[PDB]
Amino acid sequence: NSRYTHFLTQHYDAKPQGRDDRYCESIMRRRGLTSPCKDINTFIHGNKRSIEAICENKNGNPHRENLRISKSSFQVTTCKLHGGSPWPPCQYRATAGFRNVVVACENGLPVHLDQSIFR
C-alpha cells in the first residue's frame, strides 16, 4: 500500500489554516513536489476516514473508465503553478474549494487523484 502512502503525501493535509498562495508554496516544497515544479496539485482536507470511504459505496460511485467519485463534499486546496519556469523557485496560486473528489482505488484505498476536475 505504498501507493496509498504516496496519495496521502501528495493529496492530503488534515488541518491547514491559510490556504493562500504562501500555503501552496510551502506545502508543495514540504511534500517534495517542486523538482520539477508540479503544474497543478490539489490537497484534500479533513479526516482520512472520509477519503478512504470513497472506495466503498458508503461514500463513492463508479466514475468513467477506472475511477470513483465521492458522494460527500471535501474542503480542498488547489495549487496552480505560474511564472513560466518549470524549475524552482515554484510560485503557486492557491484556489480553495469545497466539492466532491475523483480518485482511483486499489484494495479499498485511494491511490490516484484525478486533477482534471480542478483544472
Side-chain angles (χ1 to χ4, degrees), residues 1-26 28-39 41-43 45-50 52-53 55-68 70-116 118-119:
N1 58 122
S2 181
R3 280 140 207 288
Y4 174 54
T5 286
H6 201 43
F7 181 83
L8 296 177
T9 296
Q10 286 195 317
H11 299 296
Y12 179 67
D13 187 23
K15 303 172 190 298
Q17 284 274 349
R19 301 159 71 191
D20 63 344
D21 284 11
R22 314 219 265 91
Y23 166 82
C24 282
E25 284 165 3
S26 167
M28 291 298 285
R29 279 195 287 250
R30 199 181 325 138
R31 298 305 179 83
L33 302 180
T34 49
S35 204
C37 307
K38 195 158 185 294
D39 188 68
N41 190 82
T42 305
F43 296 87
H45 313 302
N47 61 127
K48 261 160 44 183
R49 168 217 327 168
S50 290
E52 292 163 20
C55 296
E56 325 140 27
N57 234 80
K58 148 169 188 167
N59 193 33
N61 290 136
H63 179 80
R64 303 314 166 196
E65 293 90 77
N66 34 231
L67 308 169
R68 295 226 105 208
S70 69
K71 293 183 172 175
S72 71
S73 304
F74 295 82
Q75 292 289 346
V76 292
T77 309
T78 295
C79 311
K80 206 284 155 53
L81 187 64
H82 91 275
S85 184
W87 296 99
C90 303
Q91 47 193 291
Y92 286 96
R93 231 75 80 89
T95 300
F98 175 71
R99 77 112 88 201
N100 56 357
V101 303
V102 175
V103 300
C105 291
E106 287 178 14
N107 302 335
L109 293 172
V111 300
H112 171 76
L113 190 75
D114 168 47
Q115 287 291 165
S116 58
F118 299 112
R119 298 184 180 277

